[PDB]
Design a protein around this ligand. Structure first.
Ligand SMILES: Nc1nc2c(ncn2[C@@H]2O[C@H](COP(=O)(O)OP(=O)(O)NP(=O)(O)O)[C@@H](O)[C@H]2O)c(=O)[nH]1
Ligand SMILES: [Mg+2]
Length: 167
């Protein structure tokens, strides 16, 4: 097809859950075991083919440390979609993700599409967040949920493409 669409996506979540790794995997097909914590935010773009349409993603990978919380609106204000990321081995990160979802539902665009990534799924031998519990939470809050692994690539392209399909 000759149709081209572009949209703004923001990633939010507690520090160390794998936001930068998820974007690097999607955009560059890379994964770095030693990824440094992000300062403020990083910007990346990727263009994909979505059933007859060329979709360009403008992605804001926010720094998740609490000291950067006040900067979040600068990145989500004009976003058409968000991926709130947690680490399946860390329940506190899952609780933090729920608070990011609440903030988006109250302060971002009322039409924003929100996805929830249960990342580091390759570490299921240390799971702390039950898949079904997270799925139920996502269903009750109208969030597009998938467990992902930036390390193995599991569901990485899938979650970004599913979001694009719903915009
Ligand atoms: N096993 C595993 N490790 C992962 C996965 N995603 C990220 N990691 C690791 O987790 C650590 C933190 O990842 P990173 O992408 O920097 O996290 P972040 O959410 O961007 N942190 P910040 O918000 O501070 O910038 C890194 O050592 C990275 O390699 C994953 O899916 N599986
Ligand atoms: Mg980061």
């Amino acid at each position: 097809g000759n149709k081209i669409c572009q949209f703004k996506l923001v990633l939010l979540g507690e520090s160390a859950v794998g936001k930068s790794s998820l974007v690097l995997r999607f955009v560059k097909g890379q994964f770095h075991e030693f990824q440094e914590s992000t300062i403020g935010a990083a910007f990346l773009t990727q263009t994909v083919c979505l059933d007859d349409t060329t979709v360009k993603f403008e992605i804001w990978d926010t720094a998740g440390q609490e000291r950067y919380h006040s900067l979040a609106p600068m990145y989500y204000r004009g976003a058409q979609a968000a991926i709130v990321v947690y680490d399946i081995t860390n329940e506190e990160s899952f609780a933090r993700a729920k608070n990011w979802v609440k903030e988006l539902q109250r302060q971002a665009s009322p039409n924003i599409v929100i996805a929830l990534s249960g990342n580091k799924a390759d570490l299921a031998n240390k799971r702390a967040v039950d898949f079904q519990e997270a799925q139920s939470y996502a269903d009750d809050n109208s969030l597009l949920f998938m467990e992902t692994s930036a390390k193995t690539s599991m569901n990485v392209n899938e979650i970004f493409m599913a979001i694009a399909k719903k915009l």
